[PDB]
UniProtKB/Swiss-Prot annotation, chain A:
Gene: ZNF568
Top-level taxon: Eukaryota
Domain KRAB positions: 48-114
Record protein name field: Zinc finger protein 568
Location relative to the cell: Nucleus
Family: Belongs to the krueppel C2H2-type zinc-finger protein family.
Self-association and partners: Interacts with TRIM28.
Primary role: Has transcriptional repression activity, partially through the recruitment of the corepressor TRIM28 but also has repression activity independently of this interaction. Essential during embryonic development, where it acts as a direct repressor of a placental-specific transcript of IGF2 in early development and regulates convergent extension movements required for axis elongation and tissue morphogenesis in all germ layers. Also important for normal morphogenesis of extraembryonic tissues including the yolk sac, extraembryonic mesoderm and placenta.
Length: 114, 117
């Protein structure tokens, strides 16, 4: 009741995690562009594919704080509804939006009613 | 014990400065030659309060200790109280919906927030 801080940071953090987030992925050798020249224009794109998301795991669900636990679902998941909302829904998902966790043990028989 | 800091400058400085920022009044008035007085005709036209503000810039705000942020909005929140207390009336601009908790670059795009309590 004497340390009522001043609070300079609290609900405003990532705002200092961006600069430790968006530098990665542009890397190495851009030396002397030895493959210059050109020619023509014709061959189509090649729709990337959702090669965007990393399939899940059974075993590592204890090493995941509500940042790693929760979230996760959002970012991988930020790719999608922005191209499926301008340009160009896997059962792989279906477990993302409804609390719980991917495995419902329906295998075999008993667990009791009460 | 001892070390009874004669609180030389707590609250006491942002009280003192003045001669330290509000000075940064230039380009001369060196013997005029350009002139002419005339009838007080053509209208004013203010400058408004659209431009007298800064569309908060996306990447910035790393460094700038959020006292250079918290005080910030409270800058363009602190020209506004002539224009919403005595003046000629502008309006509540776009970007405003932040002047607000979390942050400007909050998200709603792409939903979800994965289950927990």
């Amino acid at each position: 009741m004497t340390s009522q801080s001043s609070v300079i940071s609290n609900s405003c953090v990532t705002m200092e995690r961006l600069s430790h987030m968006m530098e990665r992925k542009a890397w190495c050798s851009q030396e002397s562009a030895l493959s210059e020249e050109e020619e023509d224009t014709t061959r189509p794109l090649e729709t990337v594919t959702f090669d965007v998301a990393v399939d899940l795991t059974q075993e590592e669900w204890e090493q995941m704080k509500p940042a790693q636990r929760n979230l996760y679902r959002d970012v991988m998941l930020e790719n999608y509804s922005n191209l499926v909302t301008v340009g160009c829904k896997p059962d792989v998902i279906f477990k993302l939006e409804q609390e719980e966790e991917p495995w419902v043990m329906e295998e075999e028989m008993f667990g009791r009613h009460c």
